[PDB]
């Protein structure tokens, strides 16, 4: 029913050579196949983070609920997004060790602060120069992908749907840099 693509040769695969390995003419490309129903992006920006006076220049990613556990990721603190959060577009961030470091220099605890992405509010929620939303959050805000949901239509099978992805995104890269899971 749901086939998410992540870059990356595997699971757990954090190396930076492949984080921007899908375009978004890529997502272009999936959306004009039959057994797509839809193809929700999570997109990614450059921004800057404000609390309390301090200023620091950071990476807004929006990224699924799985993320955290797609790439092996462990959490100093707090939460993930759960699909209520997700799909409520709610407005919660993760902060990684050195956003945290340097927004919140020594506080004993953070989930429950506000910090300003860009100019939105978001409520930390937990804490694993990056930051991550919700996707949902992140949709309606120069970027790159660094994840992409692809809803199944109806009565397909979704195995032969994700050999046909996997097959699409690999003749349109020209590299197997992505991978794919059918949840």
Do not use: C
């Amino acid at each position: 029913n749901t086939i998410d693509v992540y870059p990356g040769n595997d699971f757990g695969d954090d190396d930076p050579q492949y984080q921007q390995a899908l375009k978004y003419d890529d997502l272009i490309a999936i959306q004009k196949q039959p057994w797509v129903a839809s193809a929700t992006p999570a997109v990614s920006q450059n921004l800057r983070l404000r609390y309390n006076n301090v200023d620091v220049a950071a990476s807004a990613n929006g990224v699924s609920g799985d993320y955290f556990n797609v790439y092996g990721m462990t959490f100093s603190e707090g939460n993930t997004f759960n699909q209520e959060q997700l799909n409520g577009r709610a407005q919660v961030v993760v902060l990684d060790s050195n956003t945290r470091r340097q927004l919140f220099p020594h506080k004993a605890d953070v989930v429950g602060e506000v910090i300003l992405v860009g100019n939105m509010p978001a409520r930390v929620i937990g804490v694993a120069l990056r930051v991550w939303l919700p996707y949902s959050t992140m949709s309606g805000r120069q970027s790159w992908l660094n994840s992409i949901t692809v809803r199944v239509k109806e009565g397909f099978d979704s195995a032969e749907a994700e050999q046909q992805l996997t097959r699409l995104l690999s003749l349109r890269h020209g590299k197997k840099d992505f991978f794919t899971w059918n949840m």
